[PDB]
Design a protein around this ligand. Sequence first.
Ligand SMILES: CC(=O)NCCCC[C@H](N)C(=O)O
Ligand SMILES: CC(=O)NCCCC[C@H](N)C(=O)O
Lengths: 489, 490
Amino acid sequence: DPNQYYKIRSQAIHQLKVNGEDPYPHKFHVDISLTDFIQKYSHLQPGDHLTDITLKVAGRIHAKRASGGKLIFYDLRGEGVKLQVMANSRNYKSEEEFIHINNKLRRGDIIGVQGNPGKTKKGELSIIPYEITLLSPCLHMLPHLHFGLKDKETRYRQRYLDLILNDFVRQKFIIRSKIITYIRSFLDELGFLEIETPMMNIIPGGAVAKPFITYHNELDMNLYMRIAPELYHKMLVVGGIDRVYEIGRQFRNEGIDLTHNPEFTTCEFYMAYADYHDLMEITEKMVSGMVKHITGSYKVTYHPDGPEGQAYDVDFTPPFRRINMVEELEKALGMKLPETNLFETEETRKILDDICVAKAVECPPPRTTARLLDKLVGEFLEVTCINPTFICDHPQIPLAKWEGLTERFELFVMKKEICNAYTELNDPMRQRQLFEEQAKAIDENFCTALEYGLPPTAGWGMGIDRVAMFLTDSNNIKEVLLFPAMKPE
Amino acid sequence: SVDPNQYYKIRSQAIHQLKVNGEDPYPHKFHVDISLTDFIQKYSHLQPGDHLTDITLKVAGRIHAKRASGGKLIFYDLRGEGVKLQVMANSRNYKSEEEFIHINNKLRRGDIIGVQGNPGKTKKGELSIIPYEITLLSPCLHMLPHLHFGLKDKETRYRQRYLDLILNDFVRQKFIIRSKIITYIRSFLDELGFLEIETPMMNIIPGGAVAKPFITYHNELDMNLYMRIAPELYHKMLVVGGIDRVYEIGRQFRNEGIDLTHNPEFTTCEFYMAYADYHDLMEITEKMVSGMVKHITGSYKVTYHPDGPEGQAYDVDFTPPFRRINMVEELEKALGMKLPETNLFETEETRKILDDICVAKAVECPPPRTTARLLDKLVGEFLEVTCINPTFICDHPQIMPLAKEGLTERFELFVMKKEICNAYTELNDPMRQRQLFEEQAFIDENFCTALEYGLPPTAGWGMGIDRVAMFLTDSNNIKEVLLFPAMKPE
Ligand SMILES: CC(=O)NCCCC[C@H](N)C(=O)O
Ligand SMILES: CC(=O)NCCCC[C@H](N)C(=O)O
């Protein structure tokens, strides 16, 4: 069993220490990465052996296949590449020390290799070791070679084991970092200032979201983990920093599952003297440019239900489809809806309720205008948004800006919102009124800031984790979080 | 005269009157054709008296000064993006004389406005825009300080950062530099093949030690969580997983006192590199720091005022190579004497030798006068305060960790007598680490298990972004480099 293997191996390692062969006190200086070792010496023809060149490589042993006792082959792994170590007893420092190192090494051990490049008769590039050094043994039993960790729960609870055994996982978080790095580069080149704003607030945000509450001792007061940096960003726009963005963590005290995590990453930027239409060009350039630069093409494949399930083609080629919500809902329903400034009335609500019935689009027991419109929008518009599609001018039925239609777009990809933009409010009187009525159902410092004068501004937000899922062909959030929150063992 | 509250009430009335009259400024939208900065670059070559009636442009900004020059002419000092441009509102050139007076009498100091007009330069030689139409966009409802005065009261600057940014341009340039420091680090490490990662800020076990943590309660899991102080354990688990070069520039949290050099949240950078030791990271730190200073500021030489502008100015020279000193030997050379052999630093006999030394050289040490604390004060007064230029101080004795001949393998880089970053050779013996976590006043068994799968020889590196931003913005408290610093209750 795995526990016995662990007890046996830990004993053998303890014995190596008392014998003065402690593997850990060693430090190993690599002369060439495995990736570069391949590049330089992949041109050698079968049977080559560069006796003159001695180099030091390191990596993790994934396979050990003997060939009589005079020859052992190791599958040395690292950086996502493979390199064969052909341990030939003749070529080792001595026969006695060749036997001794092979006796102690097991699958999974970290080792450094000093030897000469070369290609075997079968033609696979190798390094012929003059000396192999154990640097850090693997004390636990790993799965059988071509087996691995299929159990997602284990993969998520032991990410280091997941990366040791599954190369596709490493490529995911490389993709994740390239997304964040691309956003910074795109926005920096537009003159945006990357900023950091408080993650702990003296009062909870004016938003529907159960918060993380923590207590500050010296202040004798509770602090609240942030849900978003918006109000800090607009205070800086008032201060004269016209273009600000922040790619940082947000916190929500809610339920954990395959699509929700208590901490997650968002990007927000605010741009003075812009409206939601100006941000549509920017969103199209960034998102499309991001996809092509990272993946090599404008067309991506996504598996909403797993590799075995259906596969959707997603075409990020510009221009992205644009739609005005009400007009397209009318065109999709084949009927004219009430004029947009009569959407608060109870007569319009009835009409929507009837429409949902007549087309078998059932609504939550709360059959309101907001909910009947939500499920109509979802069933007739959002579901058709396979390619990147801007959905704009949503009915108010409360922030944003104003003939009954909100100044805004949401960008949908694979039937889901990945980012959205708003034209911002700057009337300090109106912003105040919202706060005080919201507080009966307030940020005094932010109201004051608007009293000094916020210019016309446009806001923009994106959920990074969702974007990482769609571009890594992942269908749960635990695949794109290095150490996802997990329910108790 | 008018006090600030009365000004606010009058202005609020006036702006409400504008809405009553169908002249609401806020719903107005204004697209800018060119930024004030590019405006100056593109038309500063013009000569005095010029007026380009052939070009109409839309600029915008905040009114800082309004100077009437007769009944038909008004001058506005318009500022934005850290630059300034004069608006010469000549009633003759305005759309109409009646609209000209109407708008100018609404406008006050601090109002945000959009200007549509022609470039030009007056007879005195000030580049200006000649408005055809000025638009009120967002009025400043509060009274600002007089033009050449401002906000010197530090507390008001920190509590109302927007007003500090409106009135003080040196404040904008500080946070521009701050952002360039972080961006430069990302660029430097990204070139060396590092993977920028994100690790949990919320832990289920209190991390580290001697760091009172922020505690928060997760409702669904019915459990307490702890805000992180360092990402280190998560990083090394990723090195175990084969990601050999990782870094994270993120926020750390300490439940501590709030003062001019302590903030409950702060930014650190850490990276871990497999198959490297602290020596390998010395050349990396040197290149990164020297190149950073020169790139951002234009030279290796920086001037720092640790006591304020009207204080001693220090010349800090980042020219490579940085001075390197081994702690014990240079301490021996500075004190002019031989110290006990390094293996004997845990003996009462060594503690008395150091006590006798501290007394003989008037190195005050507050009880308890242990060896670790006696050595720290001797080092501070004979080495650390000598390090004006960037200086590596290395091989500190162990009596002064879970780090790695009685001398731990690390270097601290000191600038202006204080540590800006440090590096350690990491420990990878799992059997050791499991016992070393058994220091108390908990144990991360998940991290102990990960090491049991095998961590290669690794080296860690850590830097406080805030202190570095302080030294490069000529700031001497931490609130100057934090956009919204924590402030005691008002
Ligand atoms: C008016 C408004 O909704 N402001 C919020 C910030 C701007 C929108 C952006 N998409 C966001 O909230 O992230
Ligand atoms: C051995 C040790 O103290 N490790 C801690 C993490 C590595 C050092 C790094 N410079 C840091 O603590 O930030």
